[PDB]
Amino acid sequence: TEFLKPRLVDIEQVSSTHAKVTLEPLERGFGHTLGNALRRILLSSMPGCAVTEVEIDGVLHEYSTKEGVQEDILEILLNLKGLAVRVQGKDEVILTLNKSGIGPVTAADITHDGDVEIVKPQHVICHLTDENASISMRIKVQRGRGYVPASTRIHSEEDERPIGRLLVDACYSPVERIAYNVEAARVEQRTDLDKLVIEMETNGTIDPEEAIRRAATILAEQLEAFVDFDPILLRPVDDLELVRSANCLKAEAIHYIGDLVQRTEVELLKTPNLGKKSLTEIKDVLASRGLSLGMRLENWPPASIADE
Amino acid sequence: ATILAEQLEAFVDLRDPILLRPVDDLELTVRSANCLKAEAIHYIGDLVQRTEVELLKTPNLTEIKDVLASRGLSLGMRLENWPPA
Amino acid sequence: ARVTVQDAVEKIGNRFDLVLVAARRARQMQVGGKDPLVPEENDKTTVIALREIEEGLINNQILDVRERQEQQEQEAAEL
Amino acid sequence: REEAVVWDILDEVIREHPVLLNRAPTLHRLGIQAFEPVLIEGKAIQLHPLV
DNA sequence: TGCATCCGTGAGTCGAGGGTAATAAGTTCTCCGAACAAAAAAATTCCAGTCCCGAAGGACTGGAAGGCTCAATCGATCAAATC
C-alpha cells in the first residue's frame, strides 16, 4: 500500500457558470470509479431552493389562454424552471409578480425581501402585448435536493388543491449538465495510468468550482463511519555609491573585492588602514553579495588590472 | 473506504569543476612537474590545501602567479569538509 | 495547421504551392538559424511555416522581397 | 540499452511529425493516407474507426 | 479468303522452409612457378653527449622609505562659579 494520490492541476473555466476541471494521474480502476461516483451526487443529492408552487389569479389550468400575453401558460411555467433563486435563512418563501406596460416582464418585477436572492434579473417571465391586460401571479419556493417532476409530485402530494394553483418540476440541484472522461496518463516508464477529465456547467447561484468541493464532501461524510553575478561586483571600491570603504583597502595589495572575501576581518581590519568600524562596510556588502569568510572564487581576475 | 476517502482529499481541499581538476591539465613545466610529483599532491584542491610557503623547499613562484590569475584561482585559500569523494 | 490545410489554401488556392511556398520557407529555421514571427508553440517547422502563411503575412510574393533585399545588403557591402 | 532519456528525446520528435499508413492492395487513391502518431506501449497498431 | 499458326497474356503480399547428382585412364616427361629461406638495408628505437636563454632557486648592492616614548611650553578641555 503506497497509493498514488493525485494533485489537481487545473481548472479551465469558460464563464461564471462553466468549467473543465482536469486531473492527472490516478491508478487504473479509480479513474472510472470517481468520475461516476460524483455523478450520482450532482443529480439527486445537492441541496438547494427551487420554485415549486404557482398561483395566478383568474386561471383554471395551463391548457387555457390569457389575452394580453404573447405566450402560453406552459411557456410561462417553462421560464420559472429556467429561473435561478437563492433563499438564505428561511425554509418556505412565497413571492409576488405584478406588472403593467407594453413589453416583457423581467425578473426585477418580483417583490422580494432581503433573504431571497435572484442571480438573473433579465430573466423574462411574461410578455404583455398591449397596455390593457397585466400579469398578477404568486409563486412558491421550497428547499430540497435533486429533482422531482410534478407527475410524481402529485403522486406524493395528495392534497386536494383548489383550482388556480399550479406546480412545476422543481430544480433543486444546481448542476445543469456535467460530463467526464478518461484519457491515459504517463509516469515516465509506466504509460498505462489514467487521467481524469471532467466537464462541468451549472446554473448561477453558485461557483462552478464550489460544487466539487461541496459534493465530494458528502460522499466522504458517508464514509467516516467506515474509515474509523553583479555589475558593481566587477568594480573596485571607489565606485559603489558609498567613501570610507574605498581608500583604505588597496594598501594591503587587495585592490578589489577579490581577496577581501577570503581574508579574515581579524587581520585585514588589524592592518593600519581598517579597523573595528569597517565590518559595517564589509559584512553588509557580504549580506547582499552572499560571499563568505574564506570563500573560493570561481572566476575572479580578468586580464585588466588598474588603479586610480 | 481508506482507499477512497484519501483520493477525495484532492477534492475536499483542492477545489566547481576547477576544484576536482587533476594535475596534468596545465601543460605545466617539466621542472615543476618534477617537483609537484615530488611533493605528493593529487588534486588541485589538495594543492591549495597547502599554501605557497609549502612548495619552496624543493630543488631543480612566478609561473603559478602567472597562470592562477587567469582561469580564476589564487593561492592561500583554506578548504574545509574535504574530501567530498 | 496541425489538422488540415483548408484555411491556408483558402489563401493560396492550390494543394501544391502551399507545400511549395513552405518548402522554400521551412528551411530558414532548420539550417538557416532564424526564428518565426508567430508564437512558436514548440512546433516542427513544416507547420511553423504553415502558420506564417495562414496568418495572412505570407504568400509567394512577400517571400520574394525578403530574399531580394538580403542580396543588396551583401552586394555593396563587399565594395 | 533502452536508457532513460531515450524515450523523452523520441517523444519530442514524434510530436508534430507525420507518417504514412498503407494497406495492400491500395486499390484507390485513399489506400495510402498520411497519419500522425500518438505513441502507445504495445506490439500492434490501433486505427481510427472511420478510416 | 479462311484456313491454319503462333506469339504473348492472366490481383497484390505476408510467408514457410534449403538444394542434387549421371562417369568419365596413363603413361612418362618437363619447364612455370612458391614461400620458405636467408641474407643485406634502411629505418627506427635506443643510449649518452655537447650547447644556451632561461631553469627551481638563494643571495647581493642600491637609493628610497619606516613605527611611538618623552618634555619644557603653547593653546583649550573640564568644572564650581556668574550677567
CB C22 within 8 A of CB C5: no
- The answer as to whether A159 is a domain residue is yes
- In CATH, what number is assigned to the domain containing residue B58? 1.10.150.20
**Which overall architecture, per CATH, does domain C1-79 show?**
Alpha-Beta Complex (3.90)
In chain A, the residue whose alpha carbon lies closest to the alpha carbon of B2 is A227
- In CATH, what number is assigned to the domain containing residue A188? 3.30.1360.10
Q: Tell me the three cell numbers of residue A165.
A: 394553483
Of A172, A188, A210, the residue at which a domain comes to its end is A172
Q: Tell me the three cell numbers of residue A88.
A: 438564505
Q: Grid cell 395528495 — which residue? A: A158
Task: List the domain range (segments joined by +) for residue B67.
Answer: 16-84
Q: What is the 3-state secondary structure (H, E, C) of chain A?
A: CCCCCCECCCCEECCCCEEEEEEEEECCCCHHHHHHHCCCHHHHCCEEEEEEEEEECCCCCCCCCCCCECCCHHHHHHHHHHCCCCECCCCEEEEEEECCCCEEECCCCECCCCCECCCCCCCCCEEECCCCCCCEEEEEEEEEECEECHHHHHHHCCCCCCCCEEECCEECCCEEEEEEECCEEEECCEEEEEEEEEEEEECCCCCCCHHHHHHHHHHHHCCCCCCCCCCHHHCCCCCCCCCCCCCCCHHHCCCCCHHHHHCCCCCCCCCCCCCCCHHHHCCCHHHHCCCCCCCCCCCCCCCCCCCC
Instruction: Give the strand pairing for A190-202 and A175-181.
Output: antiparallel
Of A183, A198, A228, the residue at which a domain comes to its end is A228
- The answer as to whether A308 is a domain residue is no
- The answer as to whether A155 is a domain residue is yes
Judging contacts by C-beta atoms under 8 Å, the chain C residues touching residue D15 are 42, 44
| d(C-alpha A159, C-alpha A144), whole Å | 19
- The answer as to whether A23 is a domain residue is yes
Whether residues A224 and A246 fall in one domain: no
Q: Which helix (H) or strand (E) holds D34?
A: strand D32-35
For residue A25, say if its preceding peptide bond is cis, omega within 30 degrees of 0: yes
Note whether D41 contacts A: Cβ–Cβ < 8 A.
yes
- Of A231, A267, A299, nearest to B74 by C-alpha is A299
User: What phi and psi values does residue A271 have, to the nearest 5 degrees?
Assistant: -65, 155
Note whether A183 contacts D: Cβ–Cβ < 8 A.
no
- The answer as to whether A307 is a domain residue is no
Task: Calculate the angstrom distance between C1' of E78 and CA of A267.
Answer: 37
Whether residues A245 and A186 fall in one domain: no
Positive or negative, the CA dihedral B35, B38, B44, B50 is: negative
Q: Tell me the three cell numbers of residue A142.
A: 421550497
Tell me the count of A-B CB pairs closer than 8 A.
Answer: 74
CB A109 within 8 A of CB A98: yes
Whether residues A128 and A241 fall in one domain: no
Strand E proximity list, CB < 7 Å? A 272; B 29, 31-32, 55-56, 59-63; D 24-25
Whether residues A54 and A154 fall in one domain: yes
Q: Where are the domains of chain C?
A: 1-79
Count of structural domains, chain A? 3
Task: List the domain range (segments joined by +) for residue A98.
Answer: 48-172
Torsion on CA atoms A230, A236, A241, A246, rounded to nearest 10: 140
- The answer as to whether A65 is a domain residue is yes
Cβ-Cβ contacts under 8 Å for C58 (sequence gap 6 or more): C21, C25, C49, C52
Q: Determination technique for this PDB entry? A: cryo-EM
Q: Give the closest nucleotide to A272 (alpha carbon vs C1').
A: E67
CA angle A222, A225, A228 (to 5 degrees): 130
Resolution limit in angstroms?
Answer: 4.2
Give the 3-state secondary structure of residue D22.
Answer: strand
Whether residues A147 and A5 fall in one domain: no
Note whether B1 contacts A: Cβ–Cβ < 8 A.
yes
Of A187, A207, A228, the residue at which a domain comes to its end is A228
Whether residues A52 and A160 fall in one domain: yes
For A5, A20, A174, the CA distances from A210, given in Å and listed in that order, are 21, 13, 11
